[PDB]
């Protein structure tokens, strides 16, 4: 079943939970009584498309794991890789980084893909 | 600066705000909003489908292998990118837009993907 294993890794470490990215992805999309159902279906669609649009803007379209050229700022989190990937879960991480999520997203757009695509436009030019 | 702020800017300068316009395409009094939301989604998906079938999925600027035909517009780059806006360009080549789209569909996907399908063996 598509539902099987959904959020099973929620309490797992960030590394281990990164091996289940398709399990939590495949379950994201699927009278006033009738209107209420249409709003719920449209909302599921709108949220899916907003997340896919963000992935497109960052140059991560079609990827579950996407590497970027934005350096990590120690002001966002000064934990090392063992503390984040081996000793912490994604819920704890989200709680720690939610204050910096919009800064990071802004950099993902402003500090790379807008510059990377404009440079790729000039490398395929020669 | 801001949504459509570059509308009066040249095509070159305006090409730097593609995310500014792109991020505003997705986002009695009850059914009108539901239809407005569905319409926004269908128009978004039709444009994304066109980008997909042209091999431009996930990109705001996409280079192709379709040569530019001087019959569509005989202007040089200086008079398009530095001395023209996107509204003027859109008006100037609207008669050729579907021709270009057809060529993009034919050479940027149907031929290219079969060539890539064959290069993955040899």
């Amino acid at each position, epitope marked *: 079943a598509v539902f099987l294993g959904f959020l099973g890794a929620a309490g797992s470490t960030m590394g281990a939970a990164s091996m289940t990215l398709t399990v939590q992805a495949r379950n994201l999309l699927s009278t006033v009584w009738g209107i209420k159902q249409l709003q719920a279906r449209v909302l599921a669609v709108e949220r899916y498309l907003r997340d896919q649009q963000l992935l497109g803007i960052w140059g991560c379209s079609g990827k579950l794991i996407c590497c970027t050229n934005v350096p990590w700022n120690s002001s966002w989190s000064n934990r090392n890789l063992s503390e984040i990937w081996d000793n912490m879960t994604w819920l704890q991480w989200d709680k720690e980084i939610s204050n910096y999520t919009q800064i990071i997203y802004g950099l993902l757009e402003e500090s790379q893909n807008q*510059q990377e695509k404009n*440079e790729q*436009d*000039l*490398l395929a030019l020669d | 600066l801001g949504f459509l702020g570059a509308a009066g800017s040249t095509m070159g300068a305006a090409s730097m705000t593609l995310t500014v316009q792109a991020r505003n395409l997705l986002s009695v009094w009850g059914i009108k909003q539901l239809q407005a939301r569905v319409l926004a989604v269908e128009r978004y998906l039709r444009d994304q489908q066109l980008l997909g079938i042209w091999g431009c999925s996930g990109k705001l600027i996409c*280079c192709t292998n379709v040569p530019w035909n001087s019959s569509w517009s005989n202007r040089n*780059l*200086s008079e398009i990118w*530095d001395n023209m806006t996107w509204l003027q360009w859109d008006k100037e080549i609207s008669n050729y837009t579907q021709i270009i789209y057809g060529l993009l569909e034919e050479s940027q996907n149907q031929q290219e993907k079969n060539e890539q399908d064959l290069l993955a063996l040899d």
Partner: antibody, heavy 123, light 108 residues
């Protein structure tokens, strides 16, 4: 158009030297910039190329791991940071406008505006 | 590097040519072979850009051409003030951007 290049003219082998050239008479940020050198007894050799924005740099193999080309469009300044200078690097260096252009501009695969130049001796 | 003949020479009012022969990749593949005029003690000046085009400020006496893998600069109506080191420069590609020839010392 005028490009005035300054910097040191004598470094020891294995040392480090920076050249920098100021441009005026045209919009600096609209053109790609290159460095070309001429050994005292030889012809011209292309050394490096930077695009109009500064994010893309290209080098001749003989200097690819030793020279860094950079520009600052707010000061109309082009510079070249030279590390591990070799005996083969003695030359008059020139900044020149051109060598590439953006995809929205006509091709500029030539050097149109040349600077005064500067002689760099390694010894 | 490109191969240009050295120590070419002419006389006032006559025509001279300077050849520049390269490989199929350096000259035969791209129509971007420029020519420069360098007077001793001065920086080179651009004389020809593209195979046949001239910068503004350059007289019609300087005319470029290409055949096969060989580029040529023709200087007609040769003047005494044309004594200089002439160079060809070809665009070679993305891995190698520009390749210059040796200098041609043109005397009158």
């Amino acid at each position: 158009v005028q490009l005035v290049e300054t910097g040191g003219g004598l470094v020891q082998p294995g040392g480090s030297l920076k050249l920098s050239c100021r441009a005026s008479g045209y919009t600096f940020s609209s053109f790609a910039m290159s460095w070309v050198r001429q050994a005292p007894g030889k012809g011209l050799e292309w050394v490096s190329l930077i695009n109009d924005r500064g994010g893309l740099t290209f080098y001749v193999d003989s200097v690819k791991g030793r020279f860094t080309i950079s520009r600052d469009n707010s000061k109309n300044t082009l510079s070249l940071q030279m590390h591990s200078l070799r005996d083969g690097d003695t030359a008059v260096y020139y900044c020149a406008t051109g060598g590439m252009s953006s995809a929205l501009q006509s091709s500029k695969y030539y050097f149109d505006f040349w600077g005064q130049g500067a002689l760099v001796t390694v010894s | 590097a490109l191969t240009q003949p050295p120590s070419v020479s002419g006389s006032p009012g006559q025509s001279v040519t300077i050849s520049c022969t390269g490989t199929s990749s350096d000259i035969g593949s791209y129509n971007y072979v420029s020519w420069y005029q360098q007077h001793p003690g001065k920086a080179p000046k651009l004389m020809i850009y593209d195979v046949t085009q001239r910068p503004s400020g350059v007289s019609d006496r300087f005319s470029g051409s290409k055949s096969g893998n060989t580029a040529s600069l023709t200087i007609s109506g040769l003047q005494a003030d044309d004594e200089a080191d002439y160079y060809c420069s070809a665009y070679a590609g993305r891995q190698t951007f520009y390749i210059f020839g040796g200098g041609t010392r043109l005397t009158v």
